[PDB]
Amino acid sequence: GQLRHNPLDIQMLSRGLHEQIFGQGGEMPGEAAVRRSVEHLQKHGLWGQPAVPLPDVELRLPPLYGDNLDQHFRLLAQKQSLPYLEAANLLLQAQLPPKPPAWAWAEGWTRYGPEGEAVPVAIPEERALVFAVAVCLAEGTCPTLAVAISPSAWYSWCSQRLVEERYSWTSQLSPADLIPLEVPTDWQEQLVVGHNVSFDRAHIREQYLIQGSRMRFLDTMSMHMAISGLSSFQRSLWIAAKQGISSWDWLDISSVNSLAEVHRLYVGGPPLEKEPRELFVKGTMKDIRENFQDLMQYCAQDVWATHEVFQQQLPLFLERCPHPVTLAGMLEMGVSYLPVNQNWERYLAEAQGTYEELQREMKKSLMDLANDACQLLSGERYKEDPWLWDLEWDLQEFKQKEDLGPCSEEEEFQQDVMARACLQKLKGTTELLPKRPQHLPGHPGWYRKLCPRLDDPAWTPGPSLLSLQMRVTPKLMALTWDGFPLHYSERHGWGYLVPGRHHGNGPYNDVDIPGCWFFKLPHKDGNSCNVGSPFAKDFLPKMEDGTLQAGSGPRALEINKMISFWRNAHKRISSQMVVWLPRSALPRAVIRHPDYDEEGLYGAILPQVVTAGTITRRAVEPTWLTASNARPDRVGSELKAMVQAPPGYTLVGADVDSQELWIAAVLGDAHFAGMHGCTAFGWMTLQGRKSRGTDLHSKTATTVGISREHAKIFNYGRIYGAGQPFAERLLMQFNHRLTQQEAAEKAQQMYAATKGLWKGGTESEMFNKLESIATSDIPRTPVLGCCISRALEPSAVQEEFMTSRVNWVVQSSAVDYLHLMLVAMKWLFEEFAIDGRFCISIHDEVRYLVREEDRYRAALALQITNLLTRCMFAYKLGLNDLPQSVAFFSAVDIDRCLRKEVTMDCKTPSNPTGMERRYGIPQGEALDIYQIIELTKGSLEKRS
Amino acid sequence: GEGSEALLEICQRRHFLSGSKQQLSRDSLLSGCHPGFGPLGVELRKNLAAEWWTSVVVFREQVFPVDALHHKPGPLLPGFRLVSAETLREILQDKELSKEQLVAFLENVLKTSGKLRENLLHGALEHYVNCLDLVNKRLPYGLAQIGVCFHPVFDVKSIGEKTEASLVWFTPPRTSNQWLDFWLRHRLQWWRKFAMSPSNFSSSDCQDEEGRKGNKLYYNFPWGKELIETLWNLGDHELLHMYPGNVSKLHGRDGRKNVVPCVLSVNGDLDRGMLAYLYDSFQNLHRKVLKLHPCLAPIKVALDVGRGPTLELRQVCQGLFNELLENGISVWPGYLETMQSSLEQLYSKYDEMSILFTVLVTETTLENGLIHLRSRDTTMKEMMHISKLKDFLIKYISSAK
Amino acid sequence: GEGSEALLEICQRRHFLSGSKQQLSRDSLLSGCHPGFGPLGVELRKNLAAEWWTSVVVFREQVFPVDALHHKPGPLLPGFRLVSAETLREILQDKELSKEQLVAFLENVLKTSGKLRENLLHGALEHYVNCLDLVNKRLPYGLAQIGVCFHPVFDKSIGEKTEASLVWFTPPRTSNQWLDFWLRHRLQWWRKFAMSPSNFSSSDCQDEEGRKGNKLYYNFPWGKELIETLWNLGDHELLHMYPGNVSKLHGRDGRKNVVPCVLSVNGDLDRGMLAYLYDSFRKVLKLHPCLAPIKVALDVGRGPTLELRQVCQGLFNELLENGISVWPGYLETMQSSLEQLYSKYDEMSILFTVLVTETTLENGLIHLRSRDTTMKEMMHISKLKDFLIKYISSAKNV
DNA sequence: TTTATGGTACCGTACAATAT
DNA sequence: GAATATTGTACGGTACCATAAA
Ligand SMILES: Cc1cn([C@H]2CC[C@@H](COP(=O)(O)OP(=O)(O)OP(=O)(O)O)O2)c(=O)[nH]c1=O
Ligand SMILES: [Mg+2]
């Protein structure tokens, strides 16, 4: 029947799927390899375990180009990236006229002729351009200036808000307020190049529509990171060395992502100017008005530098990354689209309002303690206080340079005038005292710093500058650790004093406090680190058991956790560029939909994504890629829940199941004996099930006794190299019921089986393969064959930074997996005419925006894409078969919002009622492969 | 109970409450049977009412005041009743007093009486048509009122009156729960804003006999929790009952559709809120200070005199007093006190009266113009020129607000 | 009405009064039997009460507020009775209802009967000892209160009126001097806000016992109706209310102790509001700036709706934060001619009407119209708040 | 005229908090 | 020997500017 098994009793794909994908026939595994695999599995006692056969899936895959998976993917990538490569070649091999003698001063685009003449144009008519925009931060997010390069001629664009002057401009962005850099429907499609090109993309008029892009952006930062990138530690060392452990040969072939440094490294020559005025960052509209020529010249210089860098880098990137799939995926990863509605405005106000209410509540508790502490000044009583005896209590002197009877009508008037005149006489004596007033003389010095200045427009009565992170807050609350007052040391951070001069982190004798020893508060990172603040999430369990006591103890820590995320992210969450589409620009389908709201606001957010901002070629986004999904005790944690599809549309996506685990397992299996499940680690990974609940992550969580996320952290730390003390610290942090001895024993038991002495270990094959790939002269990805950055090659780094290089193999393999997913999904959408659009990719998570009618077709396409990607990985590693258990997605989510699960209602302090109650957002569905096959009959056609 | 006794003694002594200790029990204060409030209590209630009006009526573009009579003339009523003593005397003139005649007289008395209002909801609902015409039939809109309501008190029998602030909100049926949640959050925030310990203010969920959703706001008194504000989703039953017949006049226009609005009732007790704030103010640094919020403190500035020329000091104090009054700042005229007391006693008295700042004028003020300024929260003196004292005080109050 | 009919029609239409024309007669308004007041009437009454409080309580160093209950619970009252309906229902639960039990119940209801207050004098006199201790026994001093008093109405109906009362405790020798001073002060206060101060008059009167007193009238179109009365009641009421030892009643003036005289000043705020409305009344109600319910009206012209609404919202928030009442006229979906809006705002006693157009977006100039002058004046939007607040403050000062 | 001194803008460092 | 990346806030040091003092 359709069921099949490998020589190691692991269920493989169905007969039809395998026949259509891997073809018919092949080199059978050797008997010696099978015997070696059996012996390896029997050595660990993990052989003969029965497995319930997963139901077979029978579907007719679409026609596959070429004669192999590699040929199919290569043909698809070439078809996708041919016109953009042609445009890049046209831009690279072209002449460049000199800069015009004077920049035009008019609204809209203008073309600079060969003789310097300026002729108005509606839109540029050029396939390839290098783009750079100017934004005045003091006015808003609206673009100000933009200059474009082209083989034919230069182009300049001036914002209407810069030429014409008005009292008030529109605070809500509109498509009419952006740059018209597209040609409405000989040549088709356009390529736009630039340094950090997402910033320029975010200011384009036609990029905020829901129809489609028909335009791809190439970033010089991504190519620089791919070719000569550096890690965070490497970048820090590079900056330190430039200002003023061996093998420093990588300094001459690397630079930071700044455009000037990139130009110096790749092109060289005179250094780029900087304009120390920095008018756009710090300036007004009139400053730009007066200094127009200099700003235009600087923008043109930046464009020229970007063009030179691109034409110097493109051949190197093509040589080091010859696979067209990489370029196609990089092009497709720069068209992210996040639809938002009027609920986005309400979310910002509610999150900010909740933050202000909670912040004010915590401040009032500390102000009262600060206000009451000032009474200790009288009688020198602060000396005896164990918490406030080492502060500034000095005071600053004020410097200096009958009977009765009703009154008559006239007499009453005279008394008021005489009293008023006398008071005004004293007001005339203001010609004394220092001209700049003193700040609270006579108050204790420590209290003086906590009060804002009188002339400060943000002045608030009392000590309104107090915070939990401040070094005076623990002293005011008289915090005690196990009945001992807390003390801060410059060389040791926060600790406590034991009277009598106890077992703990110490004692440290460098602190000379008479009559008391000094110990150190325990830290989650070990005894080699210092605790910067007792008001941390680590010490919340230490307050429940009474170890840490106040003098609103638990409330202070609990409220800190609620607003910890919003404190560090409110500036960039609230400053996101949102462009609201008008009624005309909306699709006709949405208007006729019953869920369409006439009074609502529909808009979109284009993330500022750098496709390769990592040495592993991972995308970087300051806000979205580090955004919390939803939590019950975090303010503003529902950020992703506000990405809501417009009516008539839904979000369809899925997440890769055990990406790194499967990549390492298949690498080890391909290196060992060329069959799936040869390694013990691979055998365990293959048999893991998510729907049943018995997978490697779940099994590790159950054995250790922690949550699944903690299990993920533990497994990924063990794979990438982590010591037993690190494991025991992680176990103690994530489990408070285990002592140090028990945690150490559990960590030793866990680490004894894995790794080993690499031979004889559970995961020795994957480690050996990763070391062999990393230590090769030119490390390349096992699948797409993309070279590592020149700054991490063994010649320029020797036996240093080994852990980063080892991690690079797996992470770049995951990036190649993402590229394959993107290209396959794009091909499937284009082939069968599916009305969809790429929404956003978060590493291993891919989301698409599809219409209400094609949701199940998109889900089937995503499942087929995952199957094809896994099969291509298996073929590239040399295995001509794929296990059934790792063939399809565990689930595919259909929902109107971005959330980790389609069932959670996202209850937060800012959103206590829930998404459904607040905005009428119902729960989604998580369909499996069988359900999708049943719904769509296993076909992607519209008629069927 | 020692803290409660001390707080009540301070309030009675400092003219917050009134009467002897016999009628100043917790039950009398909570039931509205207290003899009355002192001038400081009246000022605190006025400040609280002003804050409620600013945060509920002033800042809302669709909330309007409503005037409701204390008595409702009754042309028959189902089921305190005002009965004329002349009719009772006339009935007692006839000594027959048969069963049927007395039963008929009791029925007539029950039918004809002017009931004292127990809530402001009825009067607000009485102004539905006119106030709807005021907003030009643009739902949602609300009516707010601050007044006194009468409540029977059991224990032969007593009368308890309470001052209540009521907001009646007319909303479309679909957004009724959303508006209820919004109003609950807003009222809870308003109550927590002026409290030194906002955690003592809590909220709860409840359902009526018919199952209508509602919420209640409590305050954590030392003896327990007493309700201070309630919200109800009453639907349109009361509005339909009050206006029988055609429902065209009751139609409200939201968007482009006409619908009978739902009734949202928010009722809060200002007297119990004042008592809760007084308890919040009163918590080896023993000190009896009522740390009221600056926006609610009855008297803000205290003026005193030192030693020197009496006439010039009095003239300067009078000028400063007039300036502060013209700038809308409450000042305690402490410079008219013929008797002289130590500064410690005056500071203790002003702390017990919730005085924000104490100002004393001496001969040094005549010389250069520096006055001694003491803060209630900090208890630290600070020399300051007399010219900018008004600006400092007004900016202090505004920034605290 | 003819003038009275037109004024009543305007007041009812512009939400000053309430109810139909049947219950809006002069007798119903004067007797306190009117159905109620509209929001504009409530705002006008609040403004008048604030002015009275500022001119009587705030500026005086020896006048303090007093809280008096609406009902006085007292047995054995010499000479309407409040009866709880719960007790009546409980009595009706027992169907026996014998002669003796019903007679006893009627007797208990009669002597336990909580009288509704007809004046604030009794409550103020009830706080004599405590408020005297507040001023540290330094005569003279007074107690002021604004509240609602209940008055029986013949024709039966119930009439309630809002009254502002000041009870002044003065030494006997200066009683007449203080009475004259208070008469002059109250007459000046009443004449201050009137466009025609001559309509406010004063008269001299004597009580049954011969006690001196004064009365303040307003000249309505149909005649003169009393609005405020002053009496020199002596110490009879104070002695009656505190029988026995008179040491606690002694007040210290100069260096002597004496039982103070009682001066009662009672004024009706509802009739004062009606008098001011008649004084104010092209159909324009020219109310004083310190008493006008709504001061500023915001409108929009033609152009970008979103930006105009945003600018109007910002100006509205700024004016609200600066303590100026504004009519949100820019939320009106329906569009009307400027003449109709101007007439409506004049009938509502609107001081200034402000409209925002595209010219405001261009440069920042808004059209400002004055109620008294009916002349437009372009002005920058930045200093409008300062102009309005200085206008109100200077009107108050003069 | 010449010479201390506080206020303020800028920057480096340490610690903590987010996502995969 | 966990690895990538992003960001904020508190604290201390440095140096310029305006002031007041001799
Ligand atoms: C949390 C964490 C993650 N990583 C990387 C390595 C893999 C990728 C994605 O795997 P994921 O986190 O989604 O979890 P995953 O295994 O895919 O779980 P699911 O299968 O998605 O449920 O994240 C890491 O290096 N260190 C960490 O601490
Ligand atoms: Mg995953």
PDB file of C-alpha atoms in Angstrom, chain B residues 15 18-19 32-40 42-43 45-46 53 57-61 64-71 78-86 88-89 91-92 95-97 99 102-103 105-106 109-110 114 116 127 130-131 133-136 138 148 150 152-154 156-157 159-161 253 318 321 325-326 332-333 335-339, chain C residues 15 18-19 32 34-40 42-43 45-46 53 57-61 64-71 73 79-92 95-97 99 102-103 105-110 112 114 116 127 130-131 133-136 138 148 150 156 158-160 252 313 316-317 320-321 327-328 330-334:
ATOM      1  CA  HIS B  15     -14.515  71.533  62.546  1.00  0.00           C
ATOM      2  CA  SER B  18     -20.309  68.450  64.075  1.00  0.00           C
ATOM      3  CA  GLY B  19     -22.138  67.390  67.215  1.00  0.00           C
ATOM      4  CA  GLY B  32     -26.817  59.830  56.701  1.00  0.00           C
ATOM      5  CA  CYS B  33     -28.210  60.558  60.180  1.00  0.00           C
ATOM      6  CA  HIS B  34     -25.202  62.627  61.268  1.00  0.00           C
ATOM      7  CA  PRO B  35     -26.014  66.083  62.696  1.00  0.00           C
ATOM      8  CA  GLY B  36     -24.033  67.814  59.954  1.00  0.00           C
ATOM      9  CA  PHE B  37     -20.634  68.854  58.650  1.00  0.00           C
ATOM     10  CA  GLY B  38     -18.251  71.548  59.826  1.00  0.00           C
ATOM     11  CA  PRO B  39     -17.024  74.328  57.533  1.00  0.00           C
ATOM     12  CA  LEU B  40     -13.926  72.332  56.579  1.00  0.00           C
ATOM     13  CA  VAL B  42     -18.330  71.618  53.584  1.00  0.00           C
ATOM     14  CA  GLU B  43     -15.281  72.973  51.747  1.00  0.00           C
ATOM     15  CA  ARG B  45     -17.324  68.340  49.803  1.00  0.00           C
ATOM     16  CA  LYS B  46     -17.417  71.380  47.512  1.00  0.00           C
ATOM     17  CA  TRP B  53     -18.082  67.972  37.734  1.00  0.00           C
ATOM     18  CA  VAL B  57     -19.406  67.125  32.847  1.00  0.00           C
ATOM     19  CA  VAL B  58     -16.906  69.784  31.764  1.00  0.00           C
ATOM     20  CA  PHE B  59     -14.558  67.623  29.683  1.00  0.00           C
ATOM     21  CA  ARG B  60     -17.380  65.739  27.908  1.00  0.00           C
ATOM     22  CA  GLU B  61     -18.980  67.322  24.840  1.00  0.00           C
ATOM     23  CA  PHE B  64     -25.287  68.204  30.237  1.00  0.00           C
ATOM     24  CA  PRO B  65     -26.551  69.146  33.705  1.00  0.00           C
ATOM     25  CA  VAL B  66     -30.099  68.301  34.760  1.00  0.00           C
ATOM     26  CA  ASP B  67     -32.244  69.808  37.526  1.00  0.00           C
ATOM     27  CA  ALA B  68     -34.511  67.423  39.446  1.00  0.00           C
ATOM     28  CA  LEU B  69     -36.924  68.422  42.196  1.00  0.00           C
ATOM     29  CA  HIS B  70     -36.499  66.965  45.673  1.00  0.00           C
ATOM     30  CA  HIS B  71     -40.206  66.061  45.858  1.00  0.00           C
ATOM     31  CA  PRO B  78     -47.812  52.198  43.412  1.00  0.00           C
ATOM     32  CA  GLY B  79     -47.334  50.650  46.830  1.00  0.00           C
ATOM     33  CA  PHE B  80     -41.346  59.147  53.118  1.00  0.00           C
ATOM     34  CA  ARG B  81     -44.854  60.454  52.416  1.00  0.00           C
ATOM     35  CA  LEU B  82     -45.932  64.040  53.094  1.00  0.00           C
ATOM     36  CA  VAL B  83     -49.253  64.086  54.973  1.00  0.00           C
ATOM     37  CA  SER B  84     -50.978  67.304  56.005  1.00  0.00           C
ATOM     38  CA  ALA B  85     -51.630  67.507  59.745  1.00  0.00           C
ATOM     39  CA  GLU B  86     -54.833  69.486  59.137  1.00  0.00           C
ATOM     40  CA  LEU B  88     -55.354  64.242  60.338  1.00  0.00           C
ATOM     41  CA  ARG B  89     -56.859  66.647  62.880  1.00  0.00           C
ATOM     42  CA  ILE B  91     -60.293  63.036  60.792  1.00  0.00           C
ATOM     43  CA  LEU B  92     -59.622  62.873  64.541  1.00  0.00           C
ATOM     44  CA  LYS B  95     -64.705  60.053  66.944  1.00  0.00           C
ATOM     45  CA  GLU B  96     -66.556  57.329  65.007  1.00  0.00           C
ATOM     46  CA  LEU B  97     -63.509  56.146  63.015  1.00  0.00           C
ATOM     47  CA  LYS B  99     -63.068  50.340  59.772  1.00  0.00           C
ATOM     48  CA  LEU B 102     -60.175  54.551  58.136  1.00  0.00           C
ATOM     49  CA  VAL B 103     -59.128  52.061  55.444  1.00  0.00           C
ATOM     50  CA  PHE B 105     -58.469  57.340  54.423  1.00  0.00           C
ATOM     51  CA  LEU B 106     -55.253  55.299  54.541  1.00  0.00           C
ATOM     52  CA  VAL B 109     -53.151  59.049  51.931  1.00  0.00           C
ATOM     53  CA  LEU B 110     -51.044  56.417  50.163  1.00  0.00           C
ATOM     54  CA  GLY B 114     -45.378  63.961  47.540  1.00  0.00           C
ATOM     55  CA  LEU B 116     -39.171  62.427  48.753  1.00  0.00           C
ATOM     56  CA  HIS B 127     -35.895  65.127  30.873  1.00  0.00           C
ATOM     57  CA  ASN B 130     -35.969  67.840  25.843  1.00  0.00           C
ATOM     58  CA  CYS B 131     -32.324  66.903  26.411  1.00  0.00           C
ATOM     59  CA  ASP B 133     -33.681  67.527  21.346  1.00  0.00           C
ATOM     60  CA  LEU B 134     -30.814  69.572  22.810  1.00  0.00           C
ATOM     61  CA  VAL B 135     -28.194  67.212  21.343  1.00  0.00           C
ATOM     62  CA  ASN B 136     -30.212  67.170  18.092  1.00  0.00           C
ATOM     63  CA  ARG B 138     -27.194  62.366  18.306  1.00  0.00           C
ATOM     64  CA  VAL B 148     -29.312  65.197  48.067  1.00  0.00           C
ATOM     65  CA  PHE B 150     -33.489  60.800  51.163  1.00  0.00           C
ATOM     66  CA  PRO B 152     -35.346  55.668  55.275  1.00  0.00           C
ATOM     67  CA  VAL B 153     -33.255  54.411  58.191  1.00  0.00           C
ATOM     68  CA  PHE B 154     -34.202  51.527  60.485  1.00  0.00           C
ATOM     69  CA  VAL B 156     -38.596  54.876  66.749  1.00  0.00           C
ATOM     70  CA  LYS B 157     -37.520  55.749  63.206  1.00  0.00           C
ATOM     71  CA  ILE B 159     -34.421  60.015  58.422  1.00  0.00           C
ATOM     72  CA  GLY B 160     -31.175  59.697  56.491  1.00  0.00           C
ATOM     73  CA  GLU B 161     -30.192  62.042  53.663  1.00  0.00           C
ATOM     74  CA  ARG B 253     -30.262  58.363  15.965  1.00  0.00           C
ATOM     75  CA  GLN B 318      -3.625  91.982  54.526  1.00  0.00           C
ATOM     76  CA  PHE B 321      -4.251  87.893  51.795  1.00  0.00           C
ATOM     77  CA  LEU B 325      -7.913  85.685  47.436  1.00  0.00           C
ATOM     78  CA  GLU B 326      -7.937  87.452  44.064  1.00  0.00           C
ATOM     79  CA  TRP B 332      -6.633  80.934  56.786  1.00  0.00           C
ATOM     80  CA  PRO B 333      -6.608  84.397  58.427  1.00  0.00           C
ATOM     81  CA  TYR B 335      -2.725  86.875  61.648  1.00  0.00           C
ATOM     82  CA  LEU B 336      -5.837  88.340  63.318  1.00  0.00           C
ATOM     83  CA  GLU B 337      -5.328  86.117  66.386  1.00  0.00           C
ATOM     84  CA  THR B 338      -4.677  88.455  69.313  1.00  0.00           C
ATOM     85  CA  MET B 339      -3.373  85.601  71.468  1.00  0.00           C
TER      86      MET B 339
ATOM     87  CA  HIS C  15     -33.370  75.134  27.388  1.00  0.00           C
ATOM     88  CA  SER C  18     -38.577  73.211  31.210  1.00  0.00           C
ATOM     89  CA  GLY C  19     -42.066  71.854  30.658  1.00  0.00           C
ATOM     90  CA  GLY C  32     -41.542  77.506  43.201  1.00  0.00           C
ATOM     91  CA  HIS C  34     -42.237  75.135  38.184  1.00  0.00           C
ATOM     92  CA  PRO C  35     -41.335  71.722  36.707  1.00  0.00           C
ATOM     93  CA  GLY C  36     -37.633  72.574  36.684  1.00  0.00           C
ATOM     94  CA  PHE C  37     -34.789  74.374  34.952  1.00  0.00           C
ATOM     95  CA  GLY C  38     -32.967  73.598  31.728  1.00  0.00           C
ATOM     96  CA  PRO C  39     -29.198  73.089  31.587  1.00  0.00           C
ATOM     97  CA  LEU C  40     -28.617  76.760  30.755  1.00  0.00           C
ATOM     98  CA  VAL C  42     -28.745  75.405  35.954  1.00  0.00           C
ATOM     99  CA  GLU C  43     -25.478  76.924  34.718  1.00  0.00           C
ATOM    100  CA  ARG C  45     -27.872  79.534  38.826  1.00  0.00           C
ATOM    101  CA  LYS C  46     -24.447  78.007  39.494  1.00  0.00           C
ATOM    102  CA  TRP C  53     -20.256  83.006  47.563  1.00  0.00           C
ATOM    103  CA  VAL C  57     -18.004  84.268  52.001  1.00  0.00           C
ATOM    104  CA  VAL C  58     -14.635  84.281  50.227  1.00  0.00           C
ATOM    105  CA  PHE C  59     -13.689  87.939  50.709  1.00  0.00           C
ATOM    106  CA  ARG C  60     -14.765  88.044  54.382  1.00  0.00           C
ATOM    107  CA  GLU C  61     -12.316  86.843  57.035  1.00  0.00           C
ATOM    108  CA  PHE C  64     -17.831  80.586  57.384  1.00  0.00           C
ATOM    109  CA  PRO C  65     -20.063  78.057  55.613  1.00  0.00           C
ATOM    110  CA  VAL C  66     -22.674  76.099  57.554  1.00  0.00           C
ATOM    111  CA  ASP C  67     -24.417  72.826  56.675  1.00  0.00           C
ATOM    112  CA  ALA C  68     -28.087  72.510  57.646  1.00  0.00           C
ATOM    113  CA  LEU C  69     -30.242  69.434  57.114  1.00  0.00           C
ATOM    114  CA  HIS C  70     -33.341  69.680  54.939  1.00  0.00           C
ATOM    115  CA  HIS C  71     -35.464  67.929  57.589  1.00  0.00           C
ATOM    116  CA  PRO C  73     -36.296  65.627  63.428  1.00  0.00           C
ATOM    117  CA  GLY C  79     -48.210  74.256  67.001  1.00  0.00           C
ATOM    118  CA  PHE C  80     -46.830  69.078  56.257  1.00  0.00           C
ATOM    119  CA  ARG C  81     -45.668  65.982  58.147  1.00  0.00           C
ATOM    120  CA  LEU C  82     -43.161  63.485  56.745  1.00  0.00           C
ATOM    121  CA  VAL C  83     -44.450  59.925  57.201  1.00  0.00           C
ATOM    122  CA  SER C  84     -42.502  56.876  56.055  1.00  0.00           C
ATOM    123  CA  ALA C  85     -44.452  54.690  53.635  1.00  0.00           C
ATOM    124  CA  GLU C  86     -42.757  51.560  55.005  1.00  0.00           C
ATOM    125  CA  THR C  87     -44.473  52.010  58.377  1.00  0.00           C
ATOM    126  CA  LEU C  88     -47.816  52.550  56.633  1.00  0.00           C
ATOM    127  CA  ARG C  89     -47.355  49.349  54.619  1.00  0.00           C
ATOM    128  CA  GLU C  90     -46.381  47.424  57.761  1.00  0.00           C
ATOM    129  CA  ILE C  91     -49.502  48.703  59.534  1.00  0.00           C
ATOM    130  CA  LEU C  92     -51.645  47.744  56.530  1.00  0.00           C
ATOM    131  CA  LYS C  95     -55.755  43.554  58.786  1.00  0.00           C
ATOM    132  CA  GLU C  96     -57.112  43.832  62.347  1.00  0.00           C
ATOM    133  CA  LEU C  97     -56.728  47.632  62.601  1.00  0.00           C
ATOM    134  CA  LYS C  99     -59.718  51.493  67.136  1.00  0.00           C
ATOM    135  CA  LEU C 102     -55.067  53.033  64.951  1.00  0.00           C
ATOM    136  CA  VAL C 103     -55.556  55.949  67.360  1.00  0.00           C
ATOM    137  CA  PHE C 105     -50.556  54.986  65.514  1.00  0.00           C
ATOM    138  CA  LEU C 106     -52.031  58.353  64.515  1.00  0.00           C
ATOM    139  CA  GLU C 107     -50.825  59.904  67.778  1.00  0.00           C
ATOM    140  CA  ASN C 108     -47.334  58.474  67.227  1.00  0.00           C
ATOM    141  CA  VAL C 109     -47.297  59.819  63.660  1.00  0.00           C
ATOM    142  CA  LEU C 110     -48.320  63.276  64.880  1.00  0.00           C
ATOM    143  CA  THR C 112     -42.810  61.987  65.455  1.00  0.00           C
ATOM    144  CA  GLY C 114     -39.913  65.650  60.588  1.00  0.00           C
ATOM    145  CA  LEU C 116     -39.307  70.288  56.065  1.00  0.00           C
ATOM    146  CA  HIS C 127     -24.285  75.894  65.046  1.00  0.00           C
ATOM    147  CA  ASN C 130     -19.214  75.450  67.643  1.00  0.00           C
ATOM    148  CA  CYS C 131     -18.781  78.244  65.095  1.00  0.00           C
ATOM    149  CA  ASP C 133     -15.495  78.490  69.221  1.00  0.00           C
ATOM    150  CA  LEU C 134     -14.090  78.393  65.677  1.00  0.00           C
ATOM    151  CA  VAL C 135     -13.577  82.179  65.625  1.00  0.00           C
ATOM    152  CA  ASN C 136     -12.190  81.928  69.182  1.00  0.00           C
ATOM    153  CA  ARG C 138     -14.196  87.193  68.484  1.00  0.00           C
ATOM    154  CA  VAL C 148     -33.299  74.744  49.033  1.00  0.00           C
ATOM    155  CA  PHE C 150     -39.767  74.297  51.119  1.00  0.00           C
ATOM    156  CA  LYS C 156     -52.623  71.676  47.293  1.00  0.00           C
ATOM    157  CA  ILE C 158     -45.516  72.051  47.108  1.00  0.00           C
ATOM    158  CA  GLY C 159     -43.163  74.915  46.319  1.00  0.00           C
ATOM    159  CA  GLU C 160     -39.400  74.728  46.836  1.00  0.00           C
ATOM    160  CA  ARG C 252     -16.322  88.828  73.354  1.00  0.00           C
ATOM    161  CA  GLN C 313     -10.886  69.872  19.153  1.00  0.00           C
ATOM    162  CA  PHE C 316     -11.861  73.228  22.668  1.00  0.00           C
ATOM    163  CA  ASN C 317      -9.506  71.286  24.942  1.00  0.00           C
ATOM    164  CA  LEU C 320     -11.723  73.824  28.743  1.00  0.00           C
ATOM    165  CA  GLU C 321      -8.345  73.579  30.483  1.00  0.00           C
ATOM    166  CA  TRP C 327     -20.528  75.163  23.059  1.00  0.00           C
ATOM    167  CA  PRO C 328     -19.444  72.207  20.873  1.00  0.00           C
ATOM    168  CA  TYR C 330     -18.559  71.906  15.331  1.00  0.00           C
ATOM    169  CA  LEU C 331     -19.961  68.387  15.854  1.00  0.00           C
ATOM    170  CA  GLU C 332     -23.235  69.356  14.133  1.00  0.00           C
ATOM    171  CA  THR C 333     -23.485  67.204  11.007  1.00  0.00           C
ATOM    172  CA  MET C 334     -26.234  69.404   9.559  1.00  0.00           C
TER     173      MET C 334
END
